[PDB]
Amino acid sequence: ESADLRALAKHLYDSYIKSFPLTKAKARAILTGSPFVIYDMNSLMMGEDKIKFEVAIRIFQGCQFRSVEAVQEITEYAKSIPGFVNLDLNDQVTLLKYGVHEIIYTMLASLMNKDGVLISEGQGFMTREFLKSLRKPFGDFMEPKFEFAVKFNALELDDSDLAIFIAVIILSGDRPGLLNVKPIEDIQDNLLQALELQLKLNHPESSQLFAKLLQKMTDLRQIVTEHVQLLQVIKKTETDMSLHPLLQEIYKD
Amino acid sequence: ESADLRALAKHLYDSYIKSFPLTKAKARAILTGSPFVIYDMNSLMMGEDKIKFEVAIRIFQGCQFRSVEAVQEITEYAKSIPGFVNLDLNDQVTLLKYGVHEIIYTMLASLMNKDGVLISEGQGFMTREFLKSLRKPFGDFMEPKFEFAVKFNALELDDSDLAIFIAVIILSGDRPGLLNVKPIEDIQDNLLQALELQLKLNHPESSQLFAKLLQKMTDLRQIVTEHVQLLQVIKKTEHPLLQEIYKD
Ligand SMILES: Cc1c(C)n(Cc2ccc(-c3ccccc3C(=O)O)cc2)c2ccc(C(=O)N[C@@H](C)c3ccc([N+](=O)[O-])cc3)cc12
Ligand SMILES: Cc1c(C)n(Cc2ccc(-c3ccccc3C(=O)O)cc2)c2ccc(C(=O)N[C@@H](C)c3ccc([N+](=O)[O-])cc3)cc12
Ligand SMILES: *c1ccc([N+](=O)[O-])cc1C(=O)Nc1ccncc1
Ligand SMILES: *c1ccc([N+](=O)[O-])cc1C(=O)Nc1ccncc1
């Protein structure tokens, strides 16, 4: 019934808000009028001065601490998902391990636009161009991200929505490795039931948004494909580049 | 008013039974009289077959999948406490962060008698001799909780008593880091009233029990303070996706 779903639809908005500190609603406020903009190496060097923190490497090692903290938050988010904790532990570690990345770039879209990305909690902004002109093996780690973000941000989801979506992701069940898929799918069938109603109410003028949302996992899967191969080359150029251990468990290529 | 506190007493009970799968008055059957028994080593190995799930580790670590389950049941429980939802979201988390250990051991005492403890929904019973019979630091990890519990069930508390008492623990305004303490206490001084009443109609003979209860969070907060140091010794004994699920 409507009531049982609307209620789960709030339970999740609540956990999302407690577990994620830069929300899409907060990000958009910073981006629609303040951050320090970074566009060349001269501003970036003024940028160590201005905002809390070779050129492309200690950028990259910084983009990956931010992902380590984001895996930390995703986990905390996922526990609050009704039913998740009540699942074979090998699955909880597998739903987590594959469903992180798909979520990072969903939520990373909340910090992007046509022109750039907000770094370092909001304090800074990195132009799309500084990113698209970096060292040969680093200068496109974030390019396809931007093109998804603009495709994605188009749907104009907000946080009440993203929070059920972020949940439909985690609870996949089409994941490689899972033992007991039937309870995973049985949970997600409820999220999907929840999400469908959320969209029809928060965005009632957005025809086939549910359908058009669900389709973005196709775009989303592809993005992570491109990422693991891209990371594989940097572990061959920079065999001196150390990756974080938490991030390494998520990489069974 | 006197009739409202009887309303709230019901409200929280119905919430309790819903939010909490295994209730004391339920497990009470399993203890007195059926479940497996784990008296020594060969029974324990025989235990992974029937109740599907180093050896003394595979034990404690598993007491923690159940904690993490239990924090959710408490979380979904707290939200039925009138005006709990209405608090500053920051305070909600803080009340729950600190409240959960104190509320876990209270329920760990409805799964204990003198002789051991129920496990995995009560399809098991681990002999306290066996839990005593563990390598250090493990054999007396669960032994000070055994001492608290018989002291605690001594009051002969039922589930509706625990339902108000559980709420009262969460709404404790002395938690470090609260922002707007007044409405928290407003609810606790309400539940406290409600708990006083319930304790009389349900134990009219039990004498000054309300008082002997509030004297136990003296013991609850002292187990917790001491339990959590045992967790930091374990951080000097003994995949990273797991440790993240199971942060203290
Ligand atoms: C390129 C880059 C730098 C240099 N920093 C700051 C930083 C970070 C770490 C370190 C560092 C790392 C290891 C060891 C030492 C240091 C060190 O220099 O101290 C240095 C600089 C970033 C912070 C966030 C993002 C980002 O992608 N934004 C999203 C993900 C986001 C933005 C904001 C939020 N948010 O929660 O608000 C979530 C996601 C990118 C960068
Ligand atoms: C030592 C131990 C083991 C091995 N299991 C089973 C188990 C269960 C899960 C996992 C596990 C964990 C993480 C990831 C995967 C797995 C996995 O199994 O693979 C491993 C072993 C236990 C279950 C309960 C308790 C206990 O003290 N009782 C409390 C908790 C209780 C008593 C009564 C009730 N109740 O109300 O019914 C609840 C809890 C102790 C143990
Ligand atoms: C950028 C580059 C590399 C990695 N990584 O090693 O996994 C991650 C990122 C990144 O952008 N992470 C992130 C995106 C959005 N929000 C937070 C973190
Ligand atoms: C067992 C082992 C460690 C901890 N802890 O880190 O606080 C807790 C427990 C435990 O007894 N958990 C439990 C809670 C509620 N119901 C049943 C079991």
Swiss-Prot record, chain A:
Its main location: nucleus. Induction: (Microbial infection) Expression increases when incubated with M.tuberculosis or its lipoprotein LpqH; induction is TLR2-dependent (at protein level). Rosiglitazone binds at Q64, F65, R66, S67, H101, H227, Y251. GO terms for molecular function: alpha-actinin binding; arachidonate binding; chromatin binding; DNA binding; DNA binding domain binding; DNA-binding transcription activator activity, RNA polymerase II-specific; DNA-binding transcription factor activity; DNA-binding transcription factor activity, RNA polymerase II-specific. The keyword Ligase does not apply. Residues 4-253 form the NR LBD domain. GO terms for biological process: BMP signaling pathway; cell differentiation; cell fate commitment; cell maturation; cellular response to hypoxia; cellular response to insulin stimulus; cellular response to low-density lipoprotein particle stimulus; epithelial cell differentiation. Disulfide bonds: none annotated. Phosphorylated in basal conditions and dephosphorylated when treated with the ligand. May be dephosphorylated by PPP5C. One of its GO terms (cellular component) is intracellular membrane-bounded organelle. It comes from the Eukaryota. Keywords: Activator, Biological rhythms, Cytoplasm, Diabetes mellitus, Disease variant, DNA-binding, Glycoprotein, Isopeptide bond, Metal-binding, Nucleus, Obesity, Phosphoprotein, Receptor, Transcription, Transcription regulation, Ubl conjugation, Zinc, Zinc-finger. PDPK1 activates its transcriptional activity independently of its kinase activity. Interacts with FOXO1 (acetylated form). Heterodimer with other nuclear receptors, such as RXRA. The heterodimer with the retinoic acid receptor RXRA is called adipocyte-specific transcription factor ARF6. Interacts with NCOA6 coactivator, leading to a strong increase in transcription of target genes. Interacts with coactivator PPARBP, leading to a mild increase in transcription of target genes. Interacts with NOCA7 in a ligand-inducible manner. Interacts with NCOA1 and NCOA2 LXXLL motifs. Interacts with ASXL1, ASXL2, DNTTIP2, FAM120B, MAP2K1/MEK1, NR0B2, PDPK1, PRDM16, PRMT2 and TGFB1I1. Nuclear receptor that binds peroxisome proliferators such as hypolipidemic drugs and fatty acids. Once activated by a ligand, the nuclear receptor binds to DNA specific PPAR response elements (PPRE) and modulates the transcription of its target genes, such as acyl-CoA oxidase. It therefore controls the peroxisomal beta-oxidation pathway of fatty acids. Key regulator of adipocyte differentiation and glucose homeostasis. ARF6 acts as a key regulator of the tissue-specific adipocyte P2 (aP2) enhancer. (Microbial infection) Upon treatment with M.tuberculosis or its lipoprotein LpqH, phosphorylation of MAPK p38 and IL-6 production are modulated, probably via this protein. The 9aaTAD motif is a transactivation domain present in a large number of yeast and animal transcription factors. This is Peroxisome proliferator-activated receptor gamma. The chain holds residues 235 to 503 of 505 of the full protein.
